Ligand binder design. Structure first.
Ligand SMILES: [Zn+2]
Ligand SMILES: [Zn+2]
Ligand SMILES: [Zn+2]
Ligand SMILES: [Zn+2]
Ligand SMILES: [Zn+2]
Ligand SMILES: [Zn+2]
Ligand SMILES: [Zn+2]
Ligand SMILES: [Zn+2]
Lengths: 232, 232, 232, 232
């Protein structure tokens, strides 16, 4: 709960010298008590903080605080909420589904700080953000490529969740499950008309995330090398 | 943090039976959590309490609570804030500087409950209060005498801070440093045209404060006797 | 300080038999006392020596001395200073920034003889020197390629500094950090319009430097192989 | 020799960024070698530094360096040299003798860092400086008083030197020698027409200096009390 304590401290400091109003600091204090009292989760803390920041239009200061404390989960949640609000302003359904899946995966990661679902959600949100940028830019090829990447991410997310879950206790050989997950992702992605290229790089990023989360990167390195040979 | 807990308890009790409004009690609770969570200092607690009391015009009840709990640091801070507000209403610069120095010394004392800077700040604030009383009374001799006392206090405050700091770890003989500080205060005060009288009593009060803070009063007693011989 | 002692000895010998004047040898003696007295750093020694050599126009003899003693840090500093002077004569801003970054990295390396920042500074200075040669030659394609290499070096320099710092005490698996740094360098370099080619070779040289500095080249060898597969 | 090393370091730093010229730093280096080689004394070091500073008109920077390092002997020597130069410009013989005695006592103190002769020299130089200020001010009473103080200092200086020397090894009871020295100073001073007042305060300052140097201030405190009773 050190990140939450630092966030509360920095929000006080900010509210002490002008900047954000007092309501956000009071909410930070109450939620910091409730968490570590064992009555809510960090996801509810961050969600309430982001909702109040959006209500008061002070989200930039909250972003700066989350960068200063050095939190990736909360920052990704902030980006997800802002992107969802912007898409709701736009009103496009496929990005609605994409961001809802990203938020659900973010919540599941927040439950236990599982880095792989964090990687998946990060991929989804950054590709969606690039989609919105290209919407005003007007480069259709790039938006189609980003939709291909997002389809690959949607296909892979249950697969990476399952791979991590099985490796947790079942005891298989990570590299074998990593290779099977990557091949399944490629096959299912090409079953949707998407090249076996950019989906390959999506699977590569997710393999890197699995290696980081599982604490074993040599197997992730080997699967990365085989995928690099495959794209050739 | 027992004083803070008692202050919070008494503020509840007061807000329960009419008297002060609820906002002050809620702030007391939040700050009592933040302190003893290790995120702010007692100075911020008291400063916020006094600011809200001034905003709601209920400062007298806060004064009564601080007397009931038996706190001198908080009470001195309350007097300093009220005197600063009154002087700001008046608009006189020298008392502005005097009260700002008093508040800074009060903060430094609050950092570790250092009794000597508390004595210095108490001297400054009481002489300033007497100055404001004599302003409406109209006795110029007394106001000049109080300005002399305040100049002596300003000269002595860095000296007493340094004496306490050196005695803390360096290991000199308190009485020697006390005598040197008193003589330096007298010399610098008479360099500003002020008698070697009332400045002598200011140095005597500060020597008493140093003796109380350092836990050794026999050396303070001896320096008091030598200063009493000096004023003769 | 053996290199400094040898430099002082060789400068005496040179000044004994004509060649350089006496002022440089006297400065060498004084700075050799000050260093190893613990009052200045080797960077100040070399900087003063180079400044005097430039003032007296005897820089070639200092270069020969630095080659004879077998010092790479001092020689790179000499090249950096000469290149900065030549660019100041030319008056081009981007190479100004490039050489200033190179000099700052050289100072940081000199602080503890960190080989990786030495590699980065060497890359920057040699590409800048090639830029100046092509300026009078007049081959625009080569100058654009060298600017691409310098942009890659600028992007990578904080990354390599951070990788070395983290590996020093944090305890990660070098190869993983090396791969992440290389991929980040490639992505950021292609975000600036630069191919993923020559930037790949820049990252390869920096990976080799990291392997040399960290005392572990097998991981550097593996990352080199993966980057060689990537460029395919 | 830590003070000398710090002085040399700070002089380099100053000469590095403009300010003082290089000759002073080179002299500092050479003298810092000679001292701690065991070939000259700190008095020669400071005297050469002050002479060069006066020659180059950079004495203020040397004063700042000596304050930063925290040296009282060197600073007093600087004041003595500057005051001697100013008096030589004026051309008055009695202050010539006064400052020459002060400089000789300063050298004797520098020989072994004897604090009592430092106090005596400090008294002489500050009273002489006040004499020069009053010369342009034109207050004859003050100049006569300062001459009385200087006569008391001249009378007392051999006495304090002898008292310290005897207490060093002979083994008498300091307080007895302190009282005898003070009484002899008062008697000899009143034999020259000077009140038994300001000479009493001169003897009091010298007694304080003896107490500081000898490492025993309780006897100095007692003699101070008896002298305070005497002036009554
Ligand atoms: Zn606050
Ligand atoms: Zn299998
Ligand atoms: Zn109640
Ligand atoms: Zn003393
Ligand atoms: Zn020779
Ligand atoms: Zn990794
Ligand atoms: Zn230098
Ligand atoms: Zn006797």
């Amino acid at each position: 709960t050190e990140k939450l304590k630092k966030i509360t401290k920095l929000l006080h400091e900010l509210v002490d010298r002008g900047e954000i109003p007092e309501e956000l600091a009071t909410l930070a204090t109450l939620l910091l008590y409730l968490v570590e009292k064992g009555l809510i989760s960090e996801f509810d803390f961050i969600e309430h903080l982001v909702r109040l920041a959006e209500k008061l239009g002070v989200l930039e200061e909250l972003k700066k605080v989350l960068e200063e404390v050095g939190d990736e989960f909360g920052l990704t949640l902030v980006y997800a909420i802002s992107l969802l609000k912007e898409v709701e302003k736009e009103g496009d359904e496929e990005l609605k589904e994409y961001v809802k899946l990203a938020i659900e995966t973010l919540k599941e990661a927040f439950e236990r700080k599982n880095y792989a679902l964090l990687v998946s959600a990060k991929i989804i949100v950054e590709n969606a953000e690039e989609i919105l940028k290209a919407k005003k830019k007007g480069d259709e090829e790039k938006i189609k490529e980003l939709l291909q990447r997002l389809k690959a991410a949607k296909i892979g997310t249950p697969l990476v969740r399952e791979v991590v879950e099985r490796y947790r206790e079942e005891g298989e050989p990570l590299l074998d499950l990593l290779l099977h997950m990557a091949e399944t992702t490629i096959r299912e992605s090409e079953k949707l008309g998407v090249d076996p290229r950019l989906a390959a790089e999506v699977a590569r990023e997710m393999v890197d995330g699995v290696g980081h989360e599982t604490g074993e990167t040599e197997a992730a390195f080997r699967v990365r090398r085989e995928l690099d040979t495959v794209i050739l």
